[PDB]
């Protein structure tokens, strides 16, 4: 499929153009550093029903070398490299520095000029012929002007389950993902906050395709009073809604922090399969009964989720990394499973017989409604008599009658009707 990439110095509204191409994916803010740290992928079409889009960060002379490397890598796969530049400020030395790479790149290049929001000063498309490229074009993300001609200029050169990953910042999420698809795809830095939004990639494993997304970490709500840079957290929360398997990552060197329990709450309340994951065993000791020290401690603190399997692996030394997916596939089935109506009812009155302590609440019927998560409805004389202690009791029996491992369960109650 065709590949198209956008490059240039920062603050030229590259991500703005990328978004109005389709939807609203990349975060759009106005500041010199607030650029997309790495490359992203998407799909597009204009009368060809087939195109792909790639967005990167700004290029200049903190960390900028990794962004430059990503921009260079994106220049490889792209068929045409839309090269967007400001119009109001004319040209710049950094523009020539950017143009040097394109000069050394033997691929077709289309030049575009942004910040042309009205007709009159649209006539400012001049002096860009010195760059050595073809005819420039006008575009404005605020009003979507000149889009058809630009897309025609691009066209003239025309030739599965999703699982997420969350956690508190600086626990190795980015290192874990790029040490798993076995390549460099996302950035890794010592300072917290390296990632700035969701990164999506697709891949096939054991003749099965998969989708993996990173979420740049999550910190406490109270102390997140940043300069709208926490606007990315909304993007991270969005990925959970589109994901169906959630991987929570905890550091092994550090103990269980209170914020980790809160983060795991969001996944549980969303009715999504969870697999608790811990990283960085290279720091703390690996020995006998050190397995159970954190294995037991997690159970004591993380009571609300017990179905989640516990996996240990360190991304730095690549120990037991290949064991992550075996957990994932098993969790995939249990989140979408139905049990027979006959069998499910037969188990219900066995539980209530040995516990005849529900006037007295009456159980009459039981069945399943949804596949994911497995919702069940029980017809009773009155749902007011239902007690949260007894409601939890029903869940344990169901979770013990069958496997139902690594997935939450919800029980609904209906009146006599």
């Amino acid at each position: 499929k065709p590949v198209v990439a956008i490059v240039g110095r920062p603050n030229v509204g590259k991500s703005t153009i990328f978004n109005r191409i389709a939807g609203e994916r990349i975060s759009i803010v106005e500041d010199t550093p607030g650029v997309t740290r790495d490359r992203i992928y998407s799909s597009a079409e204009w009368l060809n029903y087939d195109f792909n889009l790639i967005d990167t960060g700004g290029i200049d002379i903190p960390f900028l070398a990794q962004i430059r490397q990503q921009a260079e890598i994106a220049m490889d796969e792209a068929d045409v490299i839309i090269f967007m530049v400001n119009g109001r400020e004319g040209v710049t030395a950094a523009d020539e520095e950017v143009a040097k790479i394109l000069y050394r790149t033997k691929k077709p290049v289309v030049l575009a000029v942004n910040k042309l929001d009205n007709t009159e000063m649209r006539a400012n498309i001049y002096d860009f012929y010195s760059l050595g490229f073809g005819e420039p074009y006008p575009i404005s993300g605020t009003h979507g002007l000149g889009l058809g001609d630009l897309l025609d200029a691009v066209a003239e050169h025309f030739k599965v389950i999703q699982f997420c990953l969350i956690g508190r910042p600086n626990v190795g999420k980015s290192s874990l993902v790029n040490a798993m698809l076995g390549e460099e795809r996302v950035i890794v830095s010592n300072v917290a906050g390296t990632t700035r939004d969701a990164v999506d990639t697709s891949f096939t494993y054991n003749q099965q395709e998969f989708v993996i997304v990173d979420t740049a970490g999550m910190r406490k709500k109270g102390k997140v009073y940043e300069t709208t840079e926490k606007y990315s957290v909304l993007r991270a929360l969005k990925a959970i809604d589109r994901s169906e398997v959630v991987a929570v990552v905890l550091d092994g060197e550090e103990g269980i922090i209170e914020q980790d329990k809160r983060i795991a709450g969001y996944a549980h309340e969303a009715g999504k399969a969870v697999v608790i994951v811990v990283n960085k065993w290279d720091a703390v000791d690996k020995d006998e009964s050190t397995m159970k020290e954190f294995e037991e401690n997690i159970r004591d603190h993380f009571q609300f989720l017990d179905y989640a399997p516990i996996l240990f692996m360190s991304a730095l030394t690549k120990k037991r990394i290949h064991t992550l997916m075996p957990a994932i596939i098993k969790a995939s089935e249990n989140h979408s499973l139905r049990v027979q109506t006959n069998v499910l009812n037969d188990v219900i009155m066995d539980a209530v017989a040995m516990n005849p302590t529900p006037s007295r609440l009456k159980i009459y019927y039981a069945t399943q409604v949804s596949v994911k998560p497995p919702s069940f409805v029980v017809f009773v004389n009155d749902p007011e008599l239902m007690h949260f202690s007894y409601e939890r009791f029903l869940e344990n029996r169901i979770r013990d009658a069958f496997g139902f491992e690594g997935t939450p369960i919800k029980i609904f109650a209906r009146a006599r009707k």
Binding site: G90, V91, T92, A93, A123, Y126, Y129, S130, G132, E135
Partner: protein, 178 residues
């Protein structure tokens, strides 16, 4: 090792020869926003200026001293040929057309652009006055006298400084190479 004076270097670039005395000046991109690039008429001062005048503006262009104006479009004569001569100026109406239709001014340094005072409605006043962050400026000849290049470098430096770029902070002066 020694930085000479202005009154000594004009008499000494007589001796650095009929050659042309030119000035380099290192400016102080970060500052591209307030960059320093430009042209000004000169005091102590052969070109061939060809104009792209449109409408009535050709009628005052043929009497000021220009060599060839045109038949309102000779970019087709520019295509496959066109030994360009000295200087290309234009007017703010056909500039957009000449820019797109003309595809031979980028790496040749004659593309009309109204940032330089060369694309305007005053074509009669424009013919008569033309005849990494660095600026080059020809101020004159070897055969000029000692009092000519002093006013020439004074006028060009006052033009540079008159234009004290925004973000004036930090040193503005780095080097003068006569």
């Amino acid at each position: 090792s020694k930085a000479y004076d202005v009154s000594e270097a004009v008499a000494l670039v007589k001796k650095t020869n009929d050659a042309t005395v030119e000035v380099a000046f290192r400016l102080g991109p970060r500052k591209n926003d307030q960059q320093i690039r430009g042209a000004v008429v000169l005091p102590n001062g052969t070109q061939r200026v060809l104009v792209f005048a449109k409408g009535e503006k050709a009628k005052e262009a043929e009497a000021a001293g220009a060599d060839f104006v045109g038949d309102t479009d000779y970019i087709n004569k520019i295509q496959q040929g066109w030994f360009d001569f000295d200087v290309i100026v234009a007017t703010p109406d056909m500039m957009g057309e000449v820019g797109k239709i003309g595809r031979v001014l980028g790496p040749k340094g004659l593309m009309p652009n109204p940032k330089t005072g060369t694309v305007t409605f005053e074509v009669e006043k424009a013919i008569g006055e033309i005849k990494a962050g660095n600026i080059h400026v020809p101020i004159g000849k070897v055969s000029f006298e000692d009092e000519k290049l002093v006013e020439n470098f004074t006028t060009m430096y006052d033009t540079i400084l008159k234009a004290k770029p925004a973000a004036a902070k930090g040193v503005y002066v780095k080097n003068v190479a006569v």
